[PDB]
Coordinates of C-alpha atoms in Angstrom, one line a residue:
Chain C
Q1 CA 2.4 -8.4 42.2
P2 CA -1.2 -9.1 41.1
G3 CA -1.8 -9.5 37.4
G4 CA -4.1 -7.7 35.0
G5 CA -6.6 -8.8 32.5
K6 CA -5.0 -9.3 29.1
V7 CA -7.0 -9.7 25.8
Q8 CA -5.3 -10.7 22.6
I9 CA -6.9 -10.8 19.2
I10 CA -4.4 -12.2 16.6
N11 CA -5.3 -12.4 12.9
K12 CA -2.4 -13.3 10.6
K13 CA -2.3 -14.9 7.2
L14 CA 1.4 -15.9 7.0
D15 CA 3.4 -16.0 10.3
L16 CA 6.9 -17.3 9.5
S17 CA 9.2 -17.2 12.6
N18 CA 12.7 -18.6 13.2
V19 CA 14.2 -18.7 16.7
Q20 CA 17.8 -20.1 17.0
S21 CA 20.5 -20.4 19.6
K22 CA 24.0 -21.4 18.5
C23 CA 22.8 -23.1 15.4
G24 CA 25.0 -22.9 12.3
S25 CA 22.7 -22.9 9.3
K26 CA 22.4 -22.0 5.6
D27 CA 19.8 -19.8 3.9
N28 CA 16.8 -19.2 6.2
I29 CA 13.7 -17.8 4.5
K30 CA 13.1 -17.6 0.8
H31 CA 10.3 -17.5 -1.8
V32 CA 7.4 -16.4 0.3
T33 CA 4.3 -15.4 -1.7
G34 CA 1.0 -14.3 -0.2
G35 CA -1.0 -14.9 -3.4
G36 CA -0.2 -17.3 -6.2
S37 CA 3.3 -18.1 -7.4
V38 CA 4.7 -19.6 -10.6
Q39 CA 8.2 -20.9 -10.4
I40 CA 10.1 -22.5 -13.3
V41 CA 13.6 -23.9 -13.1
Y42 CA 15.4 -24.8 -16.3
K43 CA 18.9 -26.4 -15.9
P44 CA 19.5 -29.1 -18.5
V45 CA 23.0 -30.5 -18.0
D46 CA 24.8 -32.0 -20.9
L47 CA 27.9 -34.2 -20.7
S48 CA 27.7 -35.9 -24.1
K49 CA 31.3 -36.8 -24.8
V50 CA 32.7 -38.1 -28.1
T51 CA 36.2 -39.7 -27.9
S52 CA 38.3 -40.8 -30.9
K53 CA 41.5 -42.8 -30.5
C54 CA 43.8 -44.0 -33.3
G55 CA 41.6 -43.9 -36.4
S56 CA 39.1 -41.8 -38.3
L57 CA 35.7 -40.5 -37.6
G58 CA 33.0 -38.8 -39.8
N59 CA 31.0 -35.7 -39.2
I60 CA 29.3 -34.8 -35.9
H61 CA 25.8 -33.4 -35.8
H62 CA 25.3 -32.6 -32.1
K63 CA 21.8 -30.9 -32.2
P64 CA 19.7 -31.6 -29.2
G65 CA 16.3 -30.1 -28.8
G66 CA 15.2 -27.6 -26.2
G67 CA 12.4 -27.9 -23.7
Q68 CA 9.0 -26.1 -24.0
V69 CA 7.9 -25.2 -20.5
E70 CA 4.5 -23.5 -21.0
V71 CA 2.1 -22.3 -18.3
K72 CA -1.5 -21.0 -18.8
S73 CA -3.5 -19.2 -16.2
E74 CA -7.0 -18.0 -17.0
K75 CA -9.8 -16.7 -14.7
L76 CA -8.0 -17.4 -11.4
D77 CA -9.7 -16.2 -8.2
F78 CA -7.9 -16.6 -4.8
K79 CA -10.0 -14.9 -2.2
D80 CA -9.0 -15.3 1.5
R81 CA -10.7 -13.9 4.6
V82 CA -8.8 -14.2 7.9
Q83 CA -11.2 -12.0 10.0
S84 CA -12.5 -11.8 13.5
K85 CA -15.8 -10.0 14.4
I86 CA -16.6 -9.2 18.1
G87 CA -19.8 -7.5 19.1
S88 CA -18.4 -6.1 22.4
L89 CA -15.1 -6.4 24.2
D90 CA -14.8 -5.6 28.0
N91 CA -11.6 -5.8 30.1
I92 CA -12.2 -4.6 33.6
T93 CA -9.6 -4.9 36.4
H94 CA -10.3 -4.3 40.1
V95 CA -7.2 -4.3 42.5
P96 CA -8.2 -2.4 45.7
Chain O
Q1 CA 3.5 -3.8 41.4
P2 CA -0.1 -4.5 40.3
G3 CA -0.6 -4.9 36.5
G4 CA -2.9 -3.1 34.2
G5 CA -5.4 -4.2 31.6
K6 CA -3.7 -4.8 28.2
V7 CA -5.7 -5.2 24.9
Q8 CA -3.9 -6.2 21.7
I9 CA -5.5 -6.3 18.3
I10 CA -3.0 -7.7 15.7
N11 CA -3.8 -7.9 12.0
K12 CA -0.8 -8.8 9.8
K13 CA -0.7 -10.5 6.4
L14 CA 3.0 -11.4 6.3
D15 CA 5.0 -11.5 9.5
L16 CA 8.5 -12.8 8.8
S17 CA 10.7 -12.7 11.9
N18 CA 14.2 -14.1 12.6
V19 CA 15.7 -14.2 16.1
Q20 CA 19.2 -15.5 16.4
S21 CA 21.9 -15.8 19.1
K22 CA 25.5 -16.8 18.1
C23 CA 24.2 -18.5 14.9
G24 CA 26.5 -18.4 11.9
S25 CA 24.3 -18.4 8.8
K26 CA 24.0 -17.5 5.1
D27 CA 21.4 -15.4 3.4
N28 CA 18.4 -14.7 5.7
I29 CA 15.3 -13.4 3.9
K30 CA 14.8 -13.1 0.2
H31 CA 12.0 -13.0 -2.5
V32 CA 9.0 -12.0 -0.4
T33 CA 6.0 -11.0 -2.4
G34 CA 2.7 -9.8 -1.0
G35 CA 0.7 -10.5 -4.2
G36 CA 1.5 -13.0 -7.0
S37 CA 5.1 -13.7 -8.1
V38 CA 6.5 -15.2 -11.3
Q39 CA 10.0 -16.6 -11.0
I40 CA 12.0 -18.1 -13.9
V41 CA 15.5 -19.5 -13.6
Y42 CA 17.3 -20.4 -16.9
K43 CA 20.7 -22.0 -16.3
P44 CA 21.5 -24.7 -19.0
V45 CA 24.9 -26.1 -18.4
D46 CA 26.8 -27.6 -21.3
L47 CA 29.9 -29.9 -21.0
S48 CA 29.7 -31.5 -24.5
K49 CA 33.4 -32.4 -25.0
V50 CA 34.8 -33.8 -28.3
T51 CA 38.3 -35.3 -28.1
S52 CA 40.4 -36.5 -31.1
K53 CA 43.6 -38.5 -30.6
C54 CA 46.0 -39.6 -33.4
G55 CA 43.8 -39.6 -36.5
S56 CA 41.3 -37.5 -38.5
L57 CA 37.8 -36.2 -37.8
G58 CA 35.3 -34.5 -40.0
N59 CA 33.2 -31.4 -39.5
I60 CA 31.5 -30.5 -36.2
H61 CA 28.0 -29.1 -36.1
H62 CA 27.4 -28.3 -32.5
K63 CA 23.9 -26.6 -32.7
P64 CA 21.8 -27.3 -29.6
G65 CA 18.3 -25.8 -29.3
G66 CA 17.2 -23.3 -26.8
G67 CA 14.4 -23.6 -24.3
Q68 CA 11.0 -21.8 -24.7
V69 CA 9.8 -20.9 -21.2
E70 CA 6.5 -19.1 -21.7
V71 CA 4.0 -18.0 -19.1
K72 CA 0.4 -16.7 -19.6
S73 CA -1.6 -14.9 -17.0
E74 CA -5.1 -13.6 -17.8
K75 CA -7.9 -12.3 -15.6
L76 CA -6.2 -13.0 -12.3
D77 CA -7.9 -11.8 -9.1
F78 CA -6.2 -12.3 -5.7
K79 CA -8.3 -10.5 -3.1
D80 CA -7.3 -10.9 0.6
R81 CA -9.0 -9.5 3.7
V82 CA -7.3 -9.8 7.0
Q83 CA -9.6 -7.6 9.1
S84 CA -11.0 -7.3 12.6
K85 CA -14.3 -5.6 13.4
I86 CA -15.1 -4.7 17.1
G87 CA -18.4 -3.0 18.0
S88 CA -17.0 -1.6 21.3
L89 CA -13.7 -1.9 23.2
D90 CA -13.5 -1.1 26.9
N91 CA -10.3 -1.2 29.1
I92 CA -10.9 0.0 32.6
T93 CA -8.4 -0.3 35.5
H94 CA -9.1 0.3 39.2
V95 CA -6.1 0.3 41.5
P96 CA -7.1 2.2 44.7
Chain H
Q1 CA 4.6 0.9 40.6
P2 CA 1.1 0.1 39.4
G3 CA 0.6 -0.3 35.7
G4 CA -1.6 1.5 33.3
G5 CA -4.1 0.3 30.7
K6 CA -2.4 -0.2 27.3
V7 CA -4.3 -0.7 24.0
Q8 CA -2.5 -1.7 20.9
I9 CA -4.0 -1.8 17.4
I10 CA -1.5 -3.2 14.9
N11 CA -2.3 -3.5 11.1
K12 CA 0.7 -4.4 9.0
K13 CA 0.9 -6.0 5.6
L14 CA 4.6 -6.9 5.5
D15 CA 6.5 -7.0 8.8
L16 CA 10.1 -8.3 8.1
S17 CA 12.3 -8.2 11.2
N18 CA 15.7 -9.6 12.0
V19 CA 17.2 -9.7 15.5
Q20 CA 20.7 -11.0 15.9
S21 CA 23.3 -11.2 18.6
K22 CA 26.9 -12.3 17.6
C23 CA 25.7 -14.0 14.4
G24 CA 28.1 -13.8 11.4
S25 CA 25.8 -13.8 8.4
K26 CA 25.6 -13.0 4.7
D27 CA 23.0 -10.9 2.8
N28 CA 20.0 -10.2 5.1
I29 CA 16.9 -8.9 3.3
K30 CA 16.4 -8.7 -0.4
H31 CA 13.7 -8.6 -3.1
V32 CA 10.7 -7.5 -1.1
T33 CA 7.7 -6.6 -3.2
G34 CA 4.3 -5.4 -1.8
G35 CA 2.4 -6.1 -5.0
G36 CA 3.3 -8.6 -7.7
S37 CA 6.8 -9.3 -8.8
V38 CA 8.3 -10.8 -12.0
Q39 CA 11.9 -12.2 -11.7
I40 CA 13.8 -13.7 -14.6
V41 CA 17.3 -15.1 -14.2
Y42 CA 19.2 -16.0 -17.4
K43 CA 22.6 -17.7 -16.8
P44 CA 23.4 -20.3 -19.5
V45 CA 26.9 -21.7 -18.8
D46 CA 28.7 -23.2 -21.7
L47 CA 31.8 -25.5 -21.4
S48 CA 31.7 -27.1 -24.8
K49 CA 35.4 -28.1 -25.3
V50 CA 36.8 -29.4 -28.6
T51 CA 40.3 -31.0 -28.3
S52 CA 42.5 -32.1 -31.3
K53 CA 45.7 -34.1 -30.8
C54 CA 48.1 -35.2 -33.5
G55 CA 46.0 -35.2 -36.6
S56 CA 43.5 -33.2 -38.6
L57 CA 40.0 -31.9 -38.0
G58 CA 37.5 -30.2 -40.3
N59 CA 35.4 -27.1 -39.8
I60 CA 33.6 -26.2 -36.6
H61 CA 30.1 -24.7 -36.5
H62 CA 29.5 -23.9 -32.8
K63 CA 26.0 -22.3 -33.1
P64 CA 23.8 -23.0 -30.1
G65 CA 20.4 -21.5 -29.8
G66 CA 19.2 -18.9 -27.3
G67 CA 16.4 -19.2 -24.8
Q68 CA 13.0 -17.5 -25.3
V69 CA 11.8 -16.5 -21.8
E70 CA 8.4 -14.8 -22.4
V71 CA 5.9 -13.6 -19.8
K72 CA 2.3 -12.4 -20.4
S73 CA 0.2 -10.6 -17.8
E74 CA -3.2 -9.3 -18.7
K75 CA -6.0 -8.0 -16.5
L76 CA -4.3 -8.7 -13.1
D77 CA -6.1 -7.4 -10.0
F78 CA -4.4 -7.9 -6.6
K79 CA -6.6 -6.1 -4.0
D80 CA -5.7 -6.5 -0.3
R81 CA -7.4 -5.1 2.8
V82 CA -5.7 -5.3 6.1
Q83 CA -8.1 -3.1 8.1
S84 CA -9.5 -2.8 11.6
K85 CA -12.8 -1.1 12.4
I86 CA -13.7 -0.3 16.0
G87 CA -16.9 1.5 17.0
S88 CA -15.6 2.9 20.2
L89 CA -12.4 2.6 22.2
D90 CA -12.1 3.4 25.9
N91 CA -9.0 3.3 28.1
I92 CA -9.7 4.5 31.7
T93 CA -7.2 4.2 34.5
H94 CA -8.0 4.9 38.2
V95 CA -5.0 4.9 40.6
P96 CA -6.0 6.8 43.7

């Protein structure tokens, strides 16, 4: 079985592949962005505990402040070029 | 069985593939954006506990502040070009 | 069985494929956006517990603030070009 001439031109920007075989796993692929991404996570956890045993205690003013997560983005320019220029492509096979 | 000439031109921007075989898994593919994405997660968890045993306690002013997650985006320009230019493509097979 | 000349021109922007075989899984594909996406999740969880044993306690003012998740988007321009230009394509097969 003689082979034939194979020509492959591959031009990808993002090629994310997962090949598994009997692999127990969690979440696979997530948060894929071709351009520009902005991700903000805001999970303040509060465990401020006030305990009072036998006795008295005054007033409680539990007033924490909040975060100020601010993002500016002005005059952004992300220009990508994954190209391939070929003047001439020949693929000739001779199997007499 | 002689082979034939194969020519492949592949131009993808996002190629996300998962191949599994007997793999127990969770969520597979999520949050795929070709352009630009903005993702904001806001989960403040509060466990502020006030406990009072045998005795007195004054007033309670439980007034926490809230977060200010702000995002600006002005004059954004994401220009991608995954191209392939070929002047001439020939694929000739001779199997006499 | 001699083969024939095959020519393939593939131009995709988003190619999301899942191939499984006896794989127990959860949610597969979700939140796929060709252009630009804005995703906001707002789950503040509150467990503020006030406990009072044998005794007295004053007034309770449980007034937390709310978040201000704000997003601006002005003059956005996402221009993609996944193209393929071929001047001439020939596929000739000779099996005498």
